[PDB]
Amino acid sequence: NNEIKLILQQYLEKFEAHYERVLQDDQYIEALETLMDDYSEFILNPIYEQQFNAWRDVEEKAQLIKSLQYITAQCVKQVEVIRARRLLDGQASIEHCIDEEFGQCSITSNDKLLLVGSGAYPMTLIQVAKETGASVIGIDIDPQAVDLGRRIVNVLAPNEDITITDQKVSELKDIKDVTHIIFSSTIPLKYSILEELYDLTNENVVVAMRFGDGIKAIFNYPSQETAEDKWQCVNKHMRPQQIFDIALYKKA
């Protein structure tokens, strides 16, 4: 208990200070990015993983995890907003292909991908459009993220077929044409949206759900059990030096 709980509380306090500073002045982004790198290195260190796993508290552990995953999700968003505003303020124009996340279920230019939680700095959305030539829809509930994302796409990828909207999945007119769906990891509602998508989507749709379980759940929303007759987990992609893992879902 004692050891890992103390560090996790200290990270929560550090994230509070860094996040509050960045809200007042975006010059403190570099310090927050460094904290996020240190946090990542902590999460992926087998020593801390073992300590975390050994802490068999139920209530306090669960709550502390939930406090961290919420504030660090806000930090991820704030980094994206600042990076986006910097690119647009200028008015000027890596290690893994997103296609890799779908294993055998490959993406061609004839396919159509929905990315849930596109974000203000939608590099992943642009990446997959450029790599695959597929049509791409990104949704984000935050209109700041919709505006920044839309205008970044128009600068960096004007020739790709990319739509960004605040529409919920039940409001997407072309939902039945979607062949591939990716969920960003830092979406609290991702499993409720997954369940809603069952009835909305065609029968052969494939979903890549990004998540973090165990110690990775302090920087990600975790996996959940799905309704067993609806979404079947056909593949789990878990790696020790990846800050998020991927669960592939198909119908029945």
Ligand X SMILES: C[S@@+](CC[C@H](N)C(=O)[O-])C[C@H]1O[C@@H](n2cnc3c(N)ncnc32)[C@H](O)[C@@H]1O
Q: What residue ranges bind ligand X (CB under 6 A)?
A: 76-77, 80, 116-117, 119-120, 139-142, 145, 184-187, 189
HSE of 131, CA atoms in CB hemisphere, 13 A: 15
Least distance CB 229 / ligand X (angstroms): 24
Least distance CB 184 / ligand X (angstroms): 4
Q: For residues 4 and 112, which CB has a smaller minimum distance to ligand X in the complex?
A: 112
Closest residue to ligand X, Cβ-based? 119
Q: For residues 122 and 134, which CB has a smaller minimum distance to ligand X in the complex?
A: 122
Q: What is the dihedral of CA 80, 191, 95, 91, to 10 degrees?
A: -30
Least distance CB 83 / ligand X (angstroms): 11
Alpha carbon distance 96, 44 (integer Å): 18
Q: For residues 55 and 198, which CB has a smaller minimum distance to ligand X in the complex?
A: 198
Least distance CB 245 / ligand X (angstroms): 13
Q: For residues 118 and 226, which CB has a smaller minimum distance to ligand X in the complex?
A: 118
3-state secondary structure of 109: coil
Least distance CB 141 / ligand X (angstroms): 4
Q: For residues 54 and 141, which CB has a smaller minimum distance to ligand X in the complex?
A: 141
Task: Tell me the sheet residues that pair with 248.
Answer: 208, 235
Alpha carbon distance 44, 207 (integer Å): 25
Alpha carbon distance 25, 2 (integer Å): 35
Alpha carbon distance 146, 122 (integer Å): 10
